[PDB]
């Protein structure tokens, strides 16, 4: 257990910042994740051999889609790492173990299509799971991989710690369903403002962990503008494919997803920062003040999209 992962100096320092980009070298992403587990959790949280086999099985079960890919998995885990590191004493040992694994697993076997597209297609997964269709699948895929031989990174936990962590992971992965985000944040807003928010109340923690999951999941909008902008193209490449597939089912897609209406992208990103991103990091910053850099970066990027619209730069 005397075997640290270390990172080159520039990464060793930048990985601690919310806005860290994990880079274009895929073969370093596993080592970045282990590094984060070792500092966030301990070098003892997981048997390294089991962790490495688990990481590589998770990687293998992410597909080669423009956005909802292995890089998104590690990026979202890194944002959670930064939240946990900036809020040291607020989370249990089980929560630190669970949430980085939840983040790495949260989009397992994603095909680049929304819950909506599965329902209009009449995909079998839409029959098996009527709401949070892809997210119940992602959790399903996580449990499958935990059950491959040699892959039970939790095997040293007690029976009841095992149940607690898998339950943290399931809520955390379900919370990445943006349809559940709006009510979750509204509730957290009221509880914070009326002063009823209580982190010893498990159902309140669940809510707070769900909003962190949304914050980590959307964290593309909290990068430096050049990362945010280039990622938006991957995001839109999936939307346009979905739009195409909607048109093949005989359904005019929403204009966000229509590759004939690319002109409307900047105004669509404005709606998204205003309806989703800014509210998310605002309430998150209210509950966890050290996460403010996420809100500040998100505001900077809103202002960068306003500049794209005012023709003061292009896409
Ligand atoms: Cl319009 C839009 N949707 C996003 N997400 C909604 C659907 O799940 C996938 C991602 C998004 C996520 C991050 C950054 C900008 C984004 N912009
Ligand atoms: Mg998802
Ligand atoms: Zn995601």
Among candidates 69, 68, 45, 156, which has minimal Cα distance to 114?
68
Residue from 116, 264, 272 to probe ligand 1 pocket by mutation (most atoms less than 8 Å from CB): 272
Resolution (Å units): 2.2
Domain ranges of the chain: 28-310
Burial-class residue 281 by CB neighbours within 10 Å (0-12, 13-18, 19+): buried
Method: X-ray
Does 224 contact ligand 1 (Cβ within 6 A)?
A: no
Residue 150, phi-psi category: left (phi > 0), alpha (psi -120 to 50), beta (remainder): left
Identify whether the C-beta of residue 299 lies closer than 8 Å to the C-beta of residue 278: yes
3-state secondary structure of 274: helix
**Which CATH code fits 28-310?**
1.10.1300.10
Distance CA 245, CA 177 (A): 21
Distance CA 118, CA 120 (A): 6
Distance CA 226, CA 246 (A): 30
Convert 4-63 into a string of H (helix), E (strand) and C (coil).
Answer: CCCCCHHHHHHCCCCCCCCCCCHHHHHHHHHHHHHHHCCCCCCCHHHHHHHHHHHHHCCC
Q: How far is the CA of 105 from the centre of ligand 1 (A)?
A: 18
């Amino acid at each position: 257990g005397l075997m640290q992962f270390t990172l080159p100096v520039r990464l060793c320092k930048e990985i601690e910042l919310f806005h860290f980009d994990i880079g274009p070298f895929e073969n370093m992403w596993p080592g970045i994740f282990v590094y984060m587990v070792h500092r966030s959790c301990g070098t003892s949280c997981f048997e390294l051999e089991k962790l490495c086999r688990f990481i590589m099985s998770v990687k293998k079960n992410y597909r080669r889609v423009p956005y909802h890919n292995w890089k998104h998995a590690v990026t979202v885990a890194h944002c959670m790492y930064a939240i946990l590191q900036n809020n040291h004493t607020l989370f249990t040992d089980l929560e630190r173990k669970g949430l980085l694994i939840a983040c790495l697993c949260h989009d397992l076997d994603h095909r680049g299509f929304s819950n909506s597209y599965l329902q209009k297609f009449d995909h079998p997964l839409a029959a098996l799971y009527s709401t949070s269709t892809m997210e119940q699948h992602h959790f399903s895929q996580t449990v499958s991989i935990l059950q491959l031989e040699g892959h039970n990174i939790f095997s040293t936990l007690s029976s009841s710690e095992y149940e607690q962590v898998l339950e943290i992971i399931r809520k955390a992965i379900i919370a990445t369903d943006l349809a559940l985000y709006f009510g979750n944040r509204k509730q957290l807003e009221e509880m914070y403002q009326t002063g009823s928010l209580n982190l010893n109340n498990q159902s309140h923690r669940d809510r707070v962990i769900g909003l962190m999951m949304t914050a980590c999941d959307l964290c593309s909008v909290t990068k430096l503008w050049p990362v945010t902008k280039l990622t938006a193209n991957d995001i839109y490449a999936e939307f346009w494919a979905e739009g195409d597939e909607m048109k093949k089912l005989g359904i005019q897609p929403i204009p966000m997803m229509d590759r004939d209406k690319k002109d409307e992208v900047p105004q669509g990103q404005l709606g998204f920062y205003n309806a989703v991103a800014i509210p998310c990091y605002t309430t998150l910053t209210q509950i966890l003040p050290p996460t403010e850099p996420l809100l500040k970066a998100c505001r900077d990027n809103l202002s960068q999209w306003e500049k794209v619209i005012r023709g003061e730069e292009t896409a």
